[PDB]
Amino acid sequence: GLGTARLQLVEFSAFVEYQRHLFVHISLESVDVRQIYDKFPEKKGGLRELYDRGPPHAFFLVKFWADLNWGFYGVSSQYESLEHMTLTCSSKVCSFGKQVVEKVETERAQLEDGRFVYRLLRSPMCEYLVNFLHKLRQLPERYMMNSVLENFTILQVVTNRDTQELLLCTAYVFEVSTSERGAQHHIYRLVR
Numbered sequence: 001g002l003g004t005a006r007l008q009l010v011e012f013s014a015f016v017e018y019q020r021h022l023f024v025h026i027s028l029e030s031v032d033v034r035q036i037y038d039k040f041p042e043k044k045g046g047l048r049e050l051y052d053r054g055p056p057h058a059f060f061l062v063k064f065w066a067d068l069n070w071g072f073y074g075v076s077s078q079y080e081s082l083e084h085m086t087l088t089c090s091s092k093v094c095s096f097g098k099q100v101v102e103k104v105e106t107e108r109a110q111l112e113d114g115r116f117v118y119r120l121l122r123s124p125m126c127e128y129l130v131n132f133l134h135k136l137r138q139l140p141e142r143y144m145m146n147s148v149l150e151n152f153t154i155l156q157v158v159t160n161r162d163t164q165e166l167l168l169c170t171a172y173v174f175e176v177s178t179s180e181r182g183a184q185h186h187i188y189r190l191v192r
């Protein structure tokens, strides 16, 4: 599972509008973090520096095989925790390791069924990704899509807003699936 004892990601989907097409969706083996340093900014606030501060158990890699065979572009996600917190979520989109978008959002805890849930429902997909998907979709071969996506990564850092503690850091890498197989993901622990 993707989480610590303090915070867990229970669901994530990126979609375009049953009547929904999921590009990627989440409803453990380990990888050496130094093998993916280059995929993210190596200067201040990079993966190496984040991993240096720790804690090591908060670091995950997700590989997505996206369904690009298909409106409103949206994202939904749910985190959970047993302690009431305010979350700061920083997403960085990187192209050839260079940061091209950073988005910072705040999410407040909602008490629900004995636990705290941090829910985004039908949130607008960020403009950079919408425009990228519009172009990626036109490609005639899956292998060409994979060539374009091998340089595309996303780093997501979730911190406790009030303490500045890192709660969860996830690196995302992308390939394309077939429409027959549909979307898939695998989650890995980042170790050093």
Ligand SMILES: COc1c(C)cc(N2C[C@@H](O)[C@@H](O)C2=O)cc1/C=C/c1ccc(Cl)cc1
Binding pocket: 014, 015, 023, 024, 066, 067, 075, 091, 103, 105, 123, 124, 125, 126, 127, 129, 133, 154, 155, 156, 172, 174
């Ligand atoms: C998993 O990485 C993401 C993370 C961490 C976050 C947001 N989010 C959250 C909000 O900021 C919203 O604006 C947004 O786009 C989107 C993605 C990815 C979107 C996507 C869609 C299709 C394909 Cl093939 C690949 C990726």
